[PDB]
Design a binder for this molecule. Structure first.
Ligand SMILES: Nc1ncnc2c1ncn2[C@@H]1O[C@H](COP(=O)(O)OP(=O)(O)O)[C@@H](O)[C@H]1O
Ligand SMILES: Nc1ncnc2c1ncn2[C@@H]1O[C@H](COP(=O)(O)OP(=O)(O)O)[C@@H](O)[C@H]1O
Ligand SMILES: [Cl-]
Ligand SMILES: [Mg+2]
Ligand SMILES: [Mg+2]
Lengths: 228, 228
């Protein structure tokens, strides 16, 4: 499986929208990324995301407390502080145990208004022998407590997804207006990645509805993981 | 006199907020700047500003038809198109005449919500023999048609501006809440530039109230000109 930054760039290579930010291997560099971003959107806030091969970062904790592998920062100096407590230190989440996985890089992103967060993945379903799109706006828990809340769209491996399936899926997720077609185009892009890269899973957790700096609502992958 | 980019970077060096963007000397580079900015704020729009030693770009026009030296762009490709018609071409404004001034670089900026636009300049007043801060929220026309709309704050070159003078100026311009102190700190930065650079004029036209990507209101220099 390829890292977050690399999957997102692959998704955007194929016409999808994703917040890949920029990766840093030192707190000095993390700060410089933030300072330069203030040239473009002055006053913006920042998000620092520990780049570790492990899930559930948002609710881990570090040696010196901290808590959470995804944290908001108001200034480049706050980016330095947070980054300095991530790089070269050990995060502890559910997927790691008391061991804790080491972190030697972070992702620095501009902070955006997140209006909605969905789960969406494109899986190779061996049983049926076809790709299947799995999405929900609420992943193993939701399927058991509310299986109806989960949508599974089998895909024709010769024709690919139909606009009918994708439009329905988008509306089933609660999207309206321009976000419906926006979601179709992004899901089409995710499928090309799935297909053209011979992936067994393209998982977007979360696929979000965010606001641009000028308040437009757009679909954007806020996380990405591609397996082969 | 130093260019927009250099003044803005100088202003931020001293604690002010300015949208310096990033300068490009080709439309290919302009496009790349926009593409990379979409990694940070996906879906954002862009502004392309012709970098020419001449004023009134917003209302100028180019020899081959295109209108305006400051133009909005929806995508990196729209940035390329606009930049390609600016770099290596001739702009015509009021300050240039039928000759038209050549442009060999543009500034690519993220588009932001602009809520208010002020004029603010720090001048070496020969008559009074001291620096004077000149600001208005409505420059030669306004001074004649509404002299009351213009505020002039003489500065003691030994004490610098007082927080009292700057706070009053901020409220005189109609600012309230956190924007008052925000404006004070930015004006303090503009004065240090004026002083430490032995300038005869630091002109910010417009000094704006803009929204951050997460809807915070902040003071930001959207243009800058420093004379010697
Ligand atoms: N640009 C951003 N602005 C604000 N919040 C963000 C941004 N990017 C990510 N987040 C938040 O970070 C959370 C955790 O992100 P994610 O990469 O999914 O980590 P995890 O493995 O903990 O789920 C997301 O649910 C989202 O709310
Ligand atoms: N980042 C931006 N987003 C939106 N509009 C902008 C941005 N930067 C500048 N503008 C607009 O461009 C106009 C012209 O900009 P400026 O640099 O002052 O050129 P000039 O004053 O020579 O016409 C401003 O009055 C403002 O309305
Ligand atoms: Cl170049
Ligand atoms: Mg995730
Ligand atoms: Mg101007």
């Amino acid at each position: 499986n390829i890292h977050e930054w690399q999957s997102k760039q692959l998704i955007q290579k194929y016409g999808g929208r994703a917040q890949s930010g920029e990766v840093a291997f030192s707190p000095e560099r993390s700060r410089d990324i933030a300072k330069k971003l203030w040239n473009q959107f002055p006053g913006c806030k920042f998000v620092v995301k520990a780049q570790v091969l492990a899930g559930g970062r948002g609710k881990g904790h570090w040696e010196h407390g901290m808590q959470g592998g995804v944290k908001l920062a108001k200034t480049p100096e706050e980016v330095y502080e947070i980054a300095n407590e991530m790089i070269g230190h050990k995060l502890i989440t559910k997927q790691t145990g008391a061991k804790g996985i080491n972190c030697n890089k972070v992702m620095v992103c501009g902070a955006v208004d997140i209006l909605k967060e969905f789960y969406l993945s494109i899986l190779l379903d061996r049983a049926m022998g076809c790709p299947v799109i799995i999405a929900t706006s609420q992943i193993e828990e939701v399927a058991q407590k509310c299986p109806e809340c989960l949508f599974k769209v089998p895909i024709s491996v010769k024709n690919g997804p139909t606009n009918e399936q994708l439009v329905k899926l988008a509306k089933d997720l609660g999207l309206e207006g321009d976000l419906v077609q926006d979601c179709v185009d992004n899901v089409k892009a995710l499928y090309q990645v799935f297909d053209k890269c011979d992936s067994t899973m393209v998982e977007i957790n979360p696929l979000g509805v965010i606001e641009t700096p000028t308040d437009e609502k757009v679909i954007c992958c806020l996380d990405a993981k591609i397996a082969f």
